[PDB]
Design a protein around this ligand. Structure first.
Ligand SMILES: Nc1ncnc2c1ncn2[C@@H]1O[C@H](COP(=O)(O)O)[C@@H](O)[C@H]1O
Ligand SMILES: [Mg+2]
Length: 390
């Protein structure tokens, strides 16, 4: 792979906030970015050097994107692997369609992670209605109470149903229209962490510090780095697990692997994203090389960047609910950004989305400081200010 040098066109399939942040990182280094996204108002397309407004399966636009760009990546985990393989006919695609296909499917990803030697949650795979009908209640009850999750990803807790008994599993499967699913045992969680790595085509890799993530209603709420409750032994185990997965996958790009730490202290892998990740946004303001810059380097064949964390950090997600302090039925109220910017630790990132809606990620605020406790205090003060907490 002869390195793709500054000045080239780089392609981005998907135009959300992750694609927007990729644009800034690539453009700062002198690259030009073409974003393929069907939405007219895409956050990434707004800042890109070129926006191809097209469906992800549109042959003419895929051909146009691959002709223009020396390398193409994605920020969209559910992108069709066939689209990435189509692009790969004429240009370099990182990560490959084959890798994204494993990572985007909950059944395949848990099989693959287990085959890498990494523990996953006890679960039962439900390929179809016919397969579920042949399973006895006892096979289901072994993983109950549990969560029934569609294999095809639903972001933000979508496509998931709590189930307490076998009859609830069977009704839940029908409610999900019979699609392939994984039934996972609900586990006793002490805390949650994510490992963030980047891997080059050569097999070289870098690792970020472990992040400790808190979710509300299945949506990431905040991230604390370095993880305050993860020992150096656990950090190495989680980083190594993510590297072992990436190596076995032949993965080129940025990979985020989310883990549970149970009450007994064991490490359980849950999910992996074949892209930069919401829990990696802190890297923009806390680390020498951000995850978006790693995505540039990996897809261009350039050397991977130093991951050194120069400042402890906390990321706070900003959801559209922040605009509805008097409830969802009442009018929107613009959040108090002037008071956020008055916090010395606050690094404000707003995505340019026009309409605030509950559950919608509108931005995030990174808090960096000399010490983690100062950063955590500022994030909590900001959460109270924004009515994220009382
Ligand atoms: N097997 C499980 N046991 C306990 N909590 C879970 C389990 N699976 C998912 N969750 C919770 O739901 C969140 C999002 O789930 P997921 O859609 O699997 O990423 C996770 O970050 C957990 O907090
Ligand atoms: Mg995944």
């Amino acid at each position: 792979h002869s390195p793709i040098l500054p000045g080239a066109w780089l392609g981005m399939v998907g135009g959300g906030q992750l694609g927007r942040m990729f644009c800034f990182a690539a453009q700062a280094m002198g690259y030009r970015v073409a974003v393929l996204d069907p939405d007219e108002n895409s956050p990434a397309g707004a800042v890109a050097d070129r926006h191809l407004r097209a469906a992800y399966n549109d042959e003419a636009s895929l051909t146009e994107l691959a002709r223009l760009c020396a390398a193409v990546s994605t920020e969209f985990e559910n992108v069709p692997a066939a689209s990435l393989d189509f692009l790969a006919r004429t240009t370099f695609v990182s990560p490959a369609g084959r890798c994204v296909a494993v990572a985007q499917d909950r059944i395949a990803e848990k099989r693959f992670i287990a085959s890498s030697g990494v523990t996953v949650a006890p679960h039962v795979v439900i390929e179809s209605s016919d397969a579920l009908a042949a399973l006895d209640d006892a096979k289901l009850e072994a993983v109950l109470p549990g969560i029934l999750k569609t294999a095809r990803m639903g972001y933000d807790g979508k496509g998931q149903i709590r189930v307490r008994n076998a009859e609830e599993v069977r009704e839940a499967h029908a409610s999900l229209a019979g699609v392939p699913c994984v039934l996972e045992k609900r586990l006793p969680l002490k805390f949650e962490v994510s490992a963030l790595i980047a891997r080059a085509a050569s097999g070289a890799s870098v690792v970020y510090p472990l992040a400790q993530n808190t979710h509300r209603d299945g949506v990431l709420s905040h991230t604390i780095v370095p993880a305050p409750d993860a020992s150096p032994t656990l950090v190495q185990q989680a980083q190594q697990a993510a590297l072992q997965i990436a190596d076995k996958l032949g993965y080129v790009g940025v990979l985020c692997v989310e883990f549970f730490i149970l009450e007994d202290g064991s490490l359980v892998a849950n999910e992996m994203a074949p892209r930069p990740h919401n829990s990696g946004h802190y890297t923009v303001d806390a680390c020498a090389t951000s995850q978006f810059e790693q995505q540039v380097r990996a897809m261009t064949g350039m050397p991977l960047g130093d991951t050194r964390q120069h400042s402890p950090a906390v990321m706070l997600n900003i959801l559209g609910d922040v605009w509805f302090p008097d409830g969802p039925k009442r009018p929107a109220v613009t959040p108090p950004w002037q008071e956020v910017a008055a916090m010395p630790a606050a690094r404000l990132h707003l995505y340019g989305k026009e309409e605030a809606r509950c559950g919608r990620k509108m931005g995030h605020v990174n808090f960096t400081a000399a010490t983690l406790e100062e950063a955590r205090t500022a994030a909590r003060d900001c959460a109270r200010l924004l009515h994220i907490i009382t």
